[PDB]
Design a protein around this ligand. Structure first.
Ligand SMILES: [Mg+2]
Ligand SMILES: [Mg+2]
Ligand SMILES: [Mg+2]
Ligand SMILES: [Mg+2]
Ligand SMILES: [Mg+2]
Ligand SMILES: [Mg+2]
Ligand SMILES: [Mg+2]
Ligand SMILES: [Mg+2]
Ligand SMILES: [Mg+2]
Ligand SMILES: [Mg+2]
Ligand SMILES: [Mg+2]
Ligand SMILES: [Mg+2]
Ligand SMILES: [Mg+2]
Ligand SMILES: [Mg+2]
Ligand SMILES: [Mg+2]
Ligand SMILES: [Mg+2]
Ligand SMILES: [Mg+2]
Ligand SMILES: [Mg+2]
Ligand SMILES: [Mg+2]
Ligand SMILES: [Mg+2]
Ligand SMILES: [Mg+2]
Ligand SMILES: [Mg+2]
Ligand SMILES: [Mg+2]
Ligand SMILES: [Mg+2]
Ligand SMILES: [Mg+2]
Ligand SMILES: [Mg+2]
Ligand SMILES: [Mg+2]
Ligand SMILES: [Mg+2]
Ligand SMILES: [Mg+2]
Ligand SMILES: [Mg+2]
Ligand SMILES: [Mg+2]
Ligand SMILES: [Mg+2]
Ligand SMILES: [Mg+2]
Ligand SMILES: [Mg+2]
Ligand SMILES: [Mg+2]
Ligand SMILES: [Mg+2]
Ligand SMILES: [Mg+2]
Ligand SMILES: [Mg+2]
Ligand SMILES: [Mg+2]
Ligand SMILES: [Mg+2]
Ligand SMILES: [Mg+2]
Ligand SMILES: [Mg+2]
Ligand SMILES: [Mg+2]
Ligand SMILES: [Mg+2]
Ligand SMILES: [Mg+2]
Ligand SMILES: [Mg+2]
Ligand SMILES: [Mg+2]
Ligand SMILES: [Mg+2]
Ligand SMILES: [Mg+2]
Ligand SMILES: [Mg+2]
Ligand SMILES: [Mg+2]
Ligand SMILES: [Mg+2]
Ligand SMILES: [Mg+2]
Ligand SMILES: [Mg+2]
Ligand SMILES: [Mg+2]
Ligand SMILES: [Mg+2]
Ligand SMILES: [Mg+2]
Ligand SMILES: [Mg+2]
Ligand SMILES: [Mg+2]
Ligand SMILES: [Mg+2]
Ligand SMILES: [Mg+2]
Ligand SMILES: [Mg+2]
Ligand SMILES: [Mg+2]
Ligand SMILES: [Mg+2]
Ligand SMILES: [Mg+2]
Ligand SMILES: [Mg+2]
Ligand SMILES: [Mg+2]
Ligand SMILES: [Mg+2]
Ligand SMILES: [Mg+2]
Ligand SMILES: [Mg+2]
Ligand SMILES: [Mg+2]
Ligand SMILES: [Mg+2]
Ligand SMILES: [Mg+2]
Ligand SMILES: [Mg+2]
Ligand SMILES: [Mg+2]
Ligand SMILES: [Mg+2]
Ligand SMILES: [Mg+2]
Ligand SMILES: [Mg+2]
Ligand SMILES: [Mg+2]
Ligand SMILES: [Mg+2]
Ligand SMILES: [Mg+2]
Ligand SMILES: [Mg+2]
Ligand SMILES: [Mg+2]
Ligand SMILES: [Mg+2]
Ligand SMILES: [Mg+2]
Ligand SMILES: [Mg+2]
Ligand SMILES: [Mg+2]
Ligand SMILES: [Mg+2]
Ligand SMILES: [Mg+2]
Ligand SMILES: [Mg+2]
Ligand SMILES: [Mg+2]
Ligand SMILES: [Mg+2]
Ligand SMILES: [Mg+2]
Ligand SMILES: [Mg+2]
Ligand SMILES: [Mg+2]
Ligand SMILES: [Mg+2]
Ligand SMILES: [Mg+2]
Ligand SMILES: [Mg+2]
Ligand SMILES: [Mg+2]
Ligand SMILES: [Mg+2]
Ligand SMILES: [Mg+2]
Ligand SMILES: [Mg+2]
Ligand SMILES: [Mg+2]
Ligand SMILES: [Mg+2]
Ligand SMILES: [Mg+2]
Ligand SMILES: [Mg+2]
Ligand SMILES: [Mg+2]
Ligand SMILES: [Mg+2]
Ligand SMILES: [Mg+2]
Ligand SMILES: [Mg+2]
Ligand SMILES: [Mg+2]
Ligand SMILES: [Mg+2]
Ligand SMILES: [Mg+2]
Ligand SMILES: [Mg+2]
Ligand SMILES: [Mg+2]
Ligand SMILES: [Mg+2]
Ligand SMILES: [Mg+2]
Ligand SMILES: [Mg+2]
Ligand SMILES: [Mg+2]
Ligand SMILES: [Mg+2]
Ligand SMILES: [Mg+2]
Ligand SMILES: [Mg+2]
Ligand SMILES: [Mg+2]
Ligand SMILES: [Mg+2]
Ligand SMILES: [Mg+2]
Ligand SMILES: [Mg+2]
Ligand SMILES: [Mg+2]
Ligand SMILES: [Mg+2]
Ligand SMILES: [Mg+2]
Ligand SMILES: [Mg+2]
Ligand SMILES: [Mg+2]
Ligand SMILES: [Mg+2]
Ligand SMILES: [Mg+2]
Ligand SMILES: [Mg+2]
Ligand SMILES: [Mg+2]
Ligand SMILES: [Mg+2]
Ligand SMILES: [Mg+2]
Ligand SMILES: [Mg+2]
Ligand SMILES: [Mg+2]
Ligand SMILES: [Mg+2]
Ligand SMILES: [Mg+2]
Ligand SMILES: [Mg+2]
Ligand SMILES: [Mg+2]
Ligand SMILES: [Mg+2]
Ligand SMILES: [Mg+2]
Ligand SMILES: [Mg+2]
Ligand SMILES: [Mg+2]
Ligand SMILES: [Mg+2]
Ligand SMILES: [Mg+2]
Ligand SMILES: [Mg+2]
Ligand SMILES: [Mg+2]
Ligand SMILES: [Mg+2]
Ligand SMILES: [Mg+2]
Ligand SMILES: [Mg+2]
Ligand SMILES: [Mg+2]
Ligand SMILES: [Mg+2]
Ligand SMILES: [Mg+2]
Ligand SMILES: [Mg+2]
Ligand SMILES: [Mg+2]
Ligand SMILES: [Mg+2]
Ligand SMILES: [Mg+2]
Ligand SMILES: [Mg+2]
Length: 265
RNA sequence: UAUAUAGGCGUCUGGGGGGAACGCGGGGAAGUGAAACAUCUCAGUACCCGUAGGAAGAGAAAACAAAAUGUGAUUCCGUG
RNA sequence: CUGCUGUGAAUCUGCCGGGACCACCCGGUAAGCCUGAAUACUUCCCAGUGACCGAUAGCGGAUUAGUACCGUGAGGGAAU
RNA sequence: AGCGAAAGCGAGUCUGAAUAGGGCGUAUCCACACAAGAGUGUGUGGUGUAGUGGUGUGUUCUGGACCCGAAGCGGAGUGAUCUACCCAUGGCCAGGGUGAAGCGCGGGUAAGACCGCGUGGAGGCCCGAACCCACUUAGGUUGAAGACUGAGGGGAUGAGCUGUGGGUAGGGGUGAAAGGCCAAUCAAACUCCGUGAUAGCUGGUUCUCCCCGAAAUGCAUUUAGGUGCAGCGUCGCAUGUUUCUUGCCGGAGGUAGAGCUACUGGAUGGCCGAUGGGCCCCACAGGGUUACUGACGUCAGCCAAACUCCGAAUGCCGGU
RNA sequence: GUCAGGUAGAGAAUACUAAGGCGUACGAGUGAACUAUGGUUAAGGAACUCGGCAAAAUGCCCCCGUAACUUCGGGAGAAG
RNA sequence: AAAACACAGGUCCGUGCGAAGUCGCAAGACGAUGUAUACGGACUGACGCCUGCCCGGUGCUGGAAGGUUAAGAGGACCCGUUAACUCCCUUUGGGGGUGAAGCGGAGAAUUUAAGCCCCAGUAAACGGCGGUGGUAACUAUAACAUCCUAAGGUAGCGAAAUUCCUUGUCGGGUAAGUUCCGACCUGCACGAAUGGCGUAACGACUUCUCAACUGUCUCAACCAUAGACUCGGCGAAAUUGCACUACGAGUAAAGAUGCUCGUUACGCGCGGCAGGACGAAAAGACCCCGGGACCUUCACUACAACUUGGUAUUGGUGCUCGAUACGGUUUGUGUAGGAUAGGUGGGAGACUGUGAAGCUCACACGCCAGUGUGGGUGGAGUCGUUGUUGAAAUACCACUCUGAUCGUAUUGGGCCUCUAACCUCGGACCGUAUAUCCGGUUCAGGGACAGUGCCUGGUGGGUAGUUUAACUGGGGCGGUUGCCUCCUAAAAUGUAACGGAGGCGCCCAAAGGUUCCCUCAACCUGGACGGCAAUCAGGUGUUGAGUGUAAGUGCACAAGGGAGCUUGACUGCGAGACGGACAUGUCGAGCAGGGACGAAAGUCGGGACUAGUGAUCCGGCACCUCUGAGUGGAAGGGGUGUCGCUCAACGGAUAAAAGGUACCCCGGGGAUAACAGGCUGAUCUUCCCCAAGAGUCCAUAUCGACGGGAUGGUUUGGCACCUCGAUGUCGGCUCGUCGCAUCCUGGGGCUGGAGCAGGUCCCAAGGGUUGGGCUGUUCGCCCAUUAAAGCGGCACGCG
C-alpha cells in the first residue's frame, strides 16, 4: 500500500515530492498511460510508471522554468559577460546559466549551505555566505559584472537597487523579477497569501518601476512568468537599463505595465 | 345462473350464566438458589385459558421379564 | 413416548419392543371404541370431639362486619 | 467379611514377574514358642467379638426456620373526573388607538414608476379590564392554604381562553421536549397476587444461681466489616506427669559487640615512587631536570541492614 | 352560564352610591421591646448593595415637535 | 420562563400508491377520501452575503470477474453384524483369516444463495484539515529546499456565552475601572447548515452607562393598624432516660450543667435575646462499602424485526446443457514384416452380379507412413498356421477399453412460455329494502412467481437479561497479584508494610550416568608479528578463577577443566522421616527385574543445590487379561501411560461479559474522605546562638552569609481519635470578647542622633484605629484623608 507519489520518488523520476505533485498535476507520470487519477493512489511497485519525457529536464529546481520563460521573451546573451544572481542558493537560476554556457556566475544565500552537490564542483561557481542582503559588495564579488537577476522573497525588492546599479557597468542589462504580494508593506500580504487583484500588481510594478527610474534605470519590456508558485504567486519579470532606444520612462512605462497584467499570465 | 348452491320462510329441540375444593388438556413467569451470572434452579410453581364429574383421568398388552416349563388391564399406597 | 414439517411400506416364512446398531431368541399384536371398585376434595346439611382460643386472643367480623370509614377505581378496612 | 475399577477371589485381597515389599481388612486382650533388637513380626493355642428399635437432649438438612426491615422483579387487573395531546359540538373576549390591501380622484409619466388626498377596515398589530398566566418582591413557612396572599408583572381577535361529551394505558400513552405529565406519587403509575421476595447489612431476642472460660492470630478466599480450616474455651471418654519450673549435661547458630593486613565496598592524612606529563642536549634513540598527575605498595586512625578472621547473654532442641 | 340602576368616566376600570344584601360566629383593654402592613420625613442624593433589590419617580387630554438606524412597515407615545 | 423548545425559510434522504412510515399476531387502521408543487424522516432555523479542503475510517447507495461461506442435493472410501466358507488344533468343539447381500454408523470429492472481502459514488452523511533546516524592511507581520498524509484551514470572525495563562496590551470612561466599550492577535482549546459573519423590529432575557427620583444609604425619628403584652372563655403541638440542670482552669471517646480543684450563687416566677444544651426535624442526599434501577455502546448472550437459499402448497408443453441404461460407424506410428500386432472364445473356410475389384470424393484419423464405408464408373475376385512376426487375419458369429457420434427409456440445472393452482383494495352483478363489510358468480389482469408453513445462513442496542476483581494510610489515577534468592528478621523455625534489591515462566542428548586424569585467576621474567594484553617457556600463586542461568549456601578432597564408553533423563516398590489449616510439596537407605560404567569396591530412579509452573471438571490418543442392559458381538464405559488451560486476578466464581448516572434510589459506616475539633510540627510563623563579612577604619549604629537551637499553633500538610439514626459550608452585616507578637497616643536606652525627622531595641493593652472605586471577593490594586488607618484567637467567633 505505497503512495503513488512515494513509488515515483523512490524510482528516481523526481528528486522531490513537490515535483512528484507537479508530475501528477498534469498526469505526466502514471501507469498504462492516462493522467494519474489522484495523488492518493495505492499502486504496486511492480507496475510501470511513465513520464512526460521532458528532454530539457537537466534542471535541479523550479526557478529554471521562470528563467527559461523570461529568456524566451528577452533572449539575452550570457557568454562573454559577467553575471550576478541576487541569491537563490538552490540552483534554480544559476544552473540555467550553466546550461547557457555562462562565463562566470556569482550567487548568494541567507547564510546557509543547501545548494546541489553538482554545483559544488564547477570551477565557475562562486559561493558566498550572505555577505550582505541589500547593499551588495561591488568589488568582493570579483569586480565588475554585466548582468544581475533579481530573485528576492520576503523582502520588498526596492532597497537592493542602489547596490545592483553599482554592481554593474555603464552599459548594463538587468532583468528583475517582481513578486506582487511581496512589495506591499510587510504584513499587508494579499488575502490568504495569494493575490487575484490586477490592481495590486499594478501598484507593485509601478512602485518598483518608479524606484528604478529614481536611479535612472528605465523599464525596457515586460514578461509574465509561465510557471508560478503552486498555490499562487504569479510573477512579472521586467527589464532595467539606462541607455537604449526603449527608454520608456515618461508614458510607455504605464502602457507596458498594462501589457504586463493584460497579458499576465 | 342453467345443474344448483349461498341464502330466505316456518315449526321443533337444545345452548348461554353461577359455583369453595378436588379432575383433565393446554399456555406459562419472576423474586430466589447457584455466596456474581447466562446453562441450571425456583418450577411446570404462581397466574392464565378450555372443559368436566360426582369423582375424574387411566384401563384390558403391538407390557414386563430374562433363558425362570416367569408375571399377566388400569389406578392408588409402602418399599426399592 | 411425543408435536410441527418433509418423505413414506407391508397383512403373518408380516410388523413392533427387549437403552445406538446387527444376527439369533423371547414377549406382543399399533394405527377403532367403551368400562365398575380400590384414589382426591368439601360450597352446603346433620351429629359430635378437643392436655384448642377466651374479647389487643380466636375468623377481618362474640357488638351496625366486609359494616362505618378511606379510595375515581381495582381495592384497603376498623373499634365496640 | 473383606479386598478389588471390575471380572473375581475370600481371612483374605489388590498391585506385581515376585513365598517381595506396601495398601486396606482380619473386635480386643493373654500366653507359649520360632525369628530379628530396623522401631517388632510370624505362628500355635486361648478369651471370645454388639447391634438394633422406641424415646429425652444438643447440633444439623429441607422447609418463611429466632423475630423485624428495603430500593426493587414478575403475573393478572384498575385508572385520562388531576394532567398531556387530540376529536365533536357550543360560549366568551369592557373600552380606546393604529390605519394594510382594494376601490376612487388628481398630479407626474411616449406609456410607467410613484406621490398627495379620500373612502377602506387588515393584522399570531398597539394600550388596556373580564379571562388566562406566573416575572419580581415581601409575608406565610406545627400556614388561612400539602404551593397560597399583598404589591407590582406578561398575553389579552389568537399557535387565544373556556363548558359539555368523548379517545389514547404502563416499557405503554402523550409531550412547541423540562425525563415533563399520566388522580397531592413517575429514569417506568397504582392495586392484588408470587410473598413471610431477598439483604455477607442495621436492629431486637424475655427468669435465676453454680463451675470453667476466650479471640481480635496463621492459611486460603470475586477475598479484605463475610466464610472455611488451623490456633485458643467448654463438656465427655482414654492415658497419667507425659505438662511446667530449677540445677547439671549434650548440641546448632552468626544477633549485640567487635574487627577488618580476613573478604566485598566506602573512606582520612602522610611516605617512596612509577607508568603515563613537560623540558635540556636537541631525533620521536638514549640519558637526566621539573608544582608534574603522582599505578602499585606502605605507615597510622576509621566505617557498613543486605561486610565478617571473629563473637556472646538470652532463647531453642534433646537428656538427666 | 344568564341579568347589568345613578353620578363622574373612553370604559363591564376606578371613587361614591340605588335596589338588594351584609357587619361571617371569641371578645374587652392597653401610647413596652420586636415583627408585619400603611404614612411622613431637615440636609445630602446610590455615598447602599453581588446588583438602584425595594421604594420613589413618570402617568391623562389637547396643540406643537420628534433622532441615529431601517427590511421603508417602523424606530415613535422617540426625545422634548 | 431562559440564550433552551417551536417557528415561517433552507437542504438532504426515503415514497409510484390499500405508497413509504407508524399501531397490530393477523385482519384492519392512520397516512389520505391525499398521489411527487404530495406524504414521511433528519439536520438547520426570519432576512442579507456566503458556505472552502478531505470519500482514507464508519455508514448509505450501486456493481461483479474472483476468494469465502448454511441448510439442501450427492454418497466414492471406511466401520459394525453374518449366509458362506476355509484352515488347523484339540474332536462331538472353537478360534484364525476372507467374507456376498441386507440392515445400520460415520460420512470425502462434487454442486449451491445472500452476506463479507472486492471495486465505484456519496460530507446541508457520521467524520477529519501537518512540519522541519538555516532568513531579510529599522525585530517583526510564516507566503526560500525538502519529509508525511485522506487532505493539510478557505471566507469571515477572534482575550469571544469560547483565553488556562490573565486583572494580556493600547485607548475611552471614573477622583480611583478585575466588569464594560473599540481594537490588537500568543485562537491553551473559533470557523462555515451540530451553519460563519452581519442585521431593522421584538424581549418580565444577560451585561455596562447617564438623567430623574428617592429612608437603599449617611442615620435614623415619629404616627396608626394587626400581633406581641394584660383580663375573661375555650384550648393544642413537635419534643421528652433522668433531675432541687452555675462558672473558670483542667481531666476524659481528645470541645463536660452532671468528673477534679477552686470561685460564685436566698426560694418562685413574668417579659425579652438567642451563646450552649455537639438544640428539634429528616435510620447524611457529600464520601466509601453492598444492592438496585434506568441509560449507552464495535461488553456478553439471546430474541423481535428485516433478509438468503432449499423444500411443501406447485402444475403443462417447448427448447439448452448435464448424468444414467440401451442400440449401431469407430479406434490402436513399434522394431525380427505380404502389418497404421483392440483384448477375445470359436478359425478351413467368409467376402461377387442386393454390380467388389482397380478408378471419382467425402466421411475417419493422419506422427498425412497409409488404410474401412457409398454410389457414378468398375468386372466376376479377394483371403489362411500363409512366412517374419510374444499374440492373426486386417476372410466370419458373440463378448469388447480408447475414442469423434446420433437417437430412444429416466432424472436433474437453466431458459422462453402457458394456465389450471394461488393472488388482485381492477370492473360488474347477486345475497341485499338497507351495505366502500363479507361471501359468491363472472369479465380483466398477474402466475407457478409472490405470500405462507418447515429447515437454513446473514444483519440485528430495536428490545431483554446480565457481567464489568481485589489490595490501597478514604476512593480514584498509577503500581501490584503465582514462583525463586537475599536483607529487614532481634545467632533454632517462622515473622508484616504501596519496606530495601534482583531473578523465573527456561536451557543441555550433553551441560545426564559412570571410569580415570588435571588444577585455576592474577603477578614477575624471557620470546617476530603480538601492543598489559592472543599462543610458548620458567617461576611465584590454596583459592581472590570457574561453576548454563538471579541470589544465597557450597565446592580446590573438588561440585571447577579434559577424555573414554554409554542412556539410571529406568520398570515394580519403598523402612523411616522434613514441612505442613487442608490441598500441595520435599528427602530417603534398602529389595527385585533389566542395564551402563568400573579389574573390583561400587555409583547411577537427570543436571552443586533451592525458580523454569496450573487443582478439579471435561475431552483426545496408545496399550490392557475389565465391563458389555435377553444372548453373541458391537457402540459406550473402565483401568494404565500420556496429551489439551499468560485458567498470569497464577486454591483456577461462567464455556461465554464493557461503561454512564449531577435523574438517581435503598441498606450501612464516623470501620473511611470533605468542614471544624485533637495530636504532630516536615513546611509556616516569631525569636535566638556563632560571627565570615558589609558598614572609609569599626562584626555587633544598621544589616548580618555558612551552620546551629528553639517558641507559637495563623498556613500548606501528616494521622484518621469523636461526630455519616446529620457537628450546615466562603465572604459581607449585626454584636462583640480576649492576647500582645504596639498601628496611634504614653515612658525610655543606643545611634553612622547637630536641629527637623529618623533607624533599632526595651517598657507599656486605657482609649482610639475613616469613607470610597475596581472585584463575588478574603487577599489585593488604587482614590481622598487621618494621630493611626495593628496583627491575631474565639467551630478560619457569630445563618
Ligand atoms: Mg358452566
Ligand atoms: Mg431467573
Ligand atoms: Mg443469586
Ligand atoms: Mg446473596
Ligand atoms: Mg369413590
Ligand atoms: Mg370414566
Ligand atoms: Mg376412556
Ligand atoms: Mg378480634
Ligand atoms: Mg378482661
Ligand atoms: Mg381485627
Ligand atoms: Mg366512596
Ligand atoms: Mg467394594
Ligand atoms: Mg500401577
Ligand atoms: Mg499384604
Ligand atoms: Mg441398648
Ligand atoms: Mg437418641
Ligand atoms: Mg409491580
Ligand atoms: Mg381505563
Ligand atoms: Mg383604511
Ligand atoms: Mg389606501
Ligand atoms: Mg394583538
Ligand atoms: Mg407587547
Ligand atoms: Mg396589553
Ligand atoms: Mg400594565
Ligand atoms: Mg393584566
Ligand atoms: Mg404553564
Ligand atoms: Mg425572576
Ligand atoms: Mg413563624
Ligand atoms: Mg392568619
Ligand atoms: Mg405573588
Ligand atoms: Mg397579584
Ligand atoms: Mg373548544
Ligand atoms: Mg372520558
Ligand atoms: Mg416519556
Ligand atoms: Mg390514588
Ligand atoms: Mg402527580
Ligand atoms: Mg412499568
Ligand atoms: Mg422496571
Ligand atoms: Mg417464593
Ligand atoms: Mg428477613
Ligand atoms: Mg476462674
Ligand atoms: Mg472457626
Ligand atoms: Mg474440642
Ligand atoms: Mg531440665
Ligand atoms: Mg548447655
Ligand atoms: Mg557453638
Ligand atoms: Mg546471616
Ligand atoms: Mg554493630
Ligand atoms: Mg559495600
Ligand atoms: Mg552484622
Ligand atoms: Mg357603572
Ligand atoms: Mg369596580
Ligand atoms: Mg338597604
Ligand atoms: Mg400593653
Ligand atoms: Mg414602614
Ligand atoms: Mg430626606
Ligand atoms: Mg428636601
Ligand atoms: Mg446615577
Ligand atoms: Mg457603590
Ligand atoms: Mg456605580
Ligand atoms: Mg461599599
Ligand atoms: Mg424595582
Ligand atoms: Mg410606587
Ligand atoms: Mg414628535
Ligand atoms: Mg431608539
Ligand atoms: Mg410622548
Ligand atoms: Mg417569559
Ligand atoms: Mg418561577
Ligand atoms: Mg429546551
Ligand atoms: Mg422546509
Ligand atoms: Mg441528513
Ligand atoms: Mg406498509
Ligand atoms: Mg425529493
Ligand atoms: Mg439551533
Ligand atoms: Mg440561514
Ligand atoms: Mg461544509
Ligand atoms: Mg471530505
Ligand atoms: Mg470519508
Ligand atoms: Mg467512504
Ligand atoms: Mg470508497
Ligand atoms: Mg453493499
Ligand atoms: Mg442430505
Ligand atoms: Mg483574543
Ligand atoms: Mg466578556
Ligand atoms: Mg476557546
Ligand atoms: Mg481578564
Ligand atoms: Mg484600561
Ligand atoms: Mg473591547
Ligand atoms: Mg448536524
Ligand atoms: Mg463548534
Ligand atoms: Mg457542519
Ligand atoms: Mg444558530
Ligand atoms: Mg457574533
Ligand atoms: Mg442585533
Ligand atoms: Mg415572549
Ligand atoms: Mg428570565
Ligand atoms: Mg443618633
Ligand atoms: Mg393589636
Ligand atoms: Mg387568656
Ligand atoms: Mg469549662
Ligand atoms: Mg476543654
Ligand atoms: Mg462542666
Ligand atoms: Mg454528682
Ligand atoms: Mg425568662
Ligand atoms: Mg433561645
Ligand atoms: Mg426568638
Ligand atoms: Mg436534628
Ligand atoms: Mg445512614
Ligand atoms: Mg455504590
Ligand atoms: Mg412459492
Ligand atoms: Mg418460503
Ligand atoms: Mg443489539
Ligand atoms: Mg441493555
Ligand atoms: Mg436475576
Ligand atoms: Mg465488589
Ligand atoms: Mg475497594
Ligand atoms: Mg491512597
Ligand atoms: Mg489519611
Ligand atoms: Mg532466624
Ligand atoms: Mg531469634
Ligand atoms: Mg506476622
Ligand atoms: Mg518481574
Ligand atoms: Mg555436570
Ligand atoms: Mg556423562
Ligand atoms: Mg604458568
Ligand atoms: Mg567435574
Ligand atoms: Mg525426564
Ligand atoms: Mg511413608
Ligand atoms: Mg540389579
Ligand atoms: Mg537408590
Ligand atoms: Mg466444574
Ligand atoms: Mg440391547
Ligand atoms: Mg448383549
Ligand atoms: Mg472400546
Ligand atoms: Mg483471584
Ligand atoms: Mg488466588
Ligand atoms: Mg470456570
Ligand atoms: Mg438531563
Ligand atoms: Mg441512604
Ligand atoms: Mg473514625
Ligand atoms: Mg465547623
Ligand atoms: Mg482536619
Ligand atoms: Mg467536635
Ligand atoms: Mg564599619
Ligand atoms: Mg489506626
Ligand atoms: Mg463518641
Ligand atoms: Mg457525619
Ligand atoms: Mg440522635
Ligand atoms: Mg441536630
Ligand atoms: Mg443526634
Ligand atoms: Mg465576636
Ligand atoms: Mg512587649
Ligand atoms: Mg500594644
Ligand atoms: Mg515612643
Ligand atoms: Mg529612641
Ligand atoms: Mg485607668
Ligand atoms: Mg464590580
Ligand atoms: Mg478580633
Ligand atoms: Mg466561621
Ligand atoms: Mg474567626
Ligand atoms: Mg451563617
Ligand atoms: Mg438560614
Amino acid at each position: 500500500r505505497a503512495r503513488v507519489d512515494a513509488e515515483l520518488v523512490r524510482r528516481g523520476l523526481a528528486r522531490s515530492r513537490q515535483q512528484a505533485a507537479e508530475l501528477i498535476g498534469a498526469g505526466k507520470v502514471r501507469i498504462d498511460g492516462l493522467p494519474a487519477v489522484k495523488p492518493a493512489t495505492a499502486v504496486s511497485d511492480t507496475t510501470a510508471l511513465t513520464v512526460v519525457t521532458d528532454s530539457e529536464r537537466a534542471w535541479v529546481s523550479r526557478g529554471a522554468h521562470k528563467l527559461v520563460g523570461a529568456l524566451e521573451a528577452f533572449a539575452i546573451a550570457v557568454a562573454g559577460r559577467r553575471c550576478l544572481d541576487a541569491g537563490a542558493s538552490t540552483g534554480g537560476f544559476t544552473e540555467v546559466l550553466l546550461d547557457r554556457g555562462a562565463a562566470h556566475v556569482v550567487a548568494a544565500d541567507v547564510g546557509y549551505g543547501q545548494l546541489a552537490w553538482s554545483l559544488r564542483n564547477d570551477p565557475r561557481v562562486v559561493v558566498l555566505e550572505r555577505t550582505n542582503a541589500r547593499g551588495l559588495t561591488p568589488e568582493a564579488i570579483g569586480g565588475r559584472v554585466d548582468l544581475v537577476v533579481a530573485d528576492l522573497s520576503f523582502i520588498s525588492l526596492a532597497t537592493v537597487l542602489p547596490a545592483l546599479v553599482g554592481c554593474a557597468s555603464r552599459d548594463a542589462d538587468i532583468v528583475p523579477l517582481v513578486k506582487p504580494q511581496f512589495e506591499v508593506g510587510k504584513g499587508q500580504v494579499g488575502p490568504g497569501g495569494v493575490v487575484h487583484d490586477p490592481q495590486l500588481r499594478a501598484r507593485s510594478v509601478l512602485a518598483v518601476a518608479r524606484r528604478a527610474q529614481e536611479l535612472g534605470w528605465h523599464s525596457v519590456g515586460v514578461k509574465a512568468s509561465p510557471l508560478p508558485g503552486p498555490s499562487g504567486n504569479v510573477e512579472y519579470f521586467l527589464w532595467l537599463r539606462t541607455q537604449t532606444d526603449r527608454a520608456l520612462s515618461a508614458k510607455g512605462l504605464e502602457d507596458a505595465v498594462h501589457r504586463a497584467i493584460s497579458e499576465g499570465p
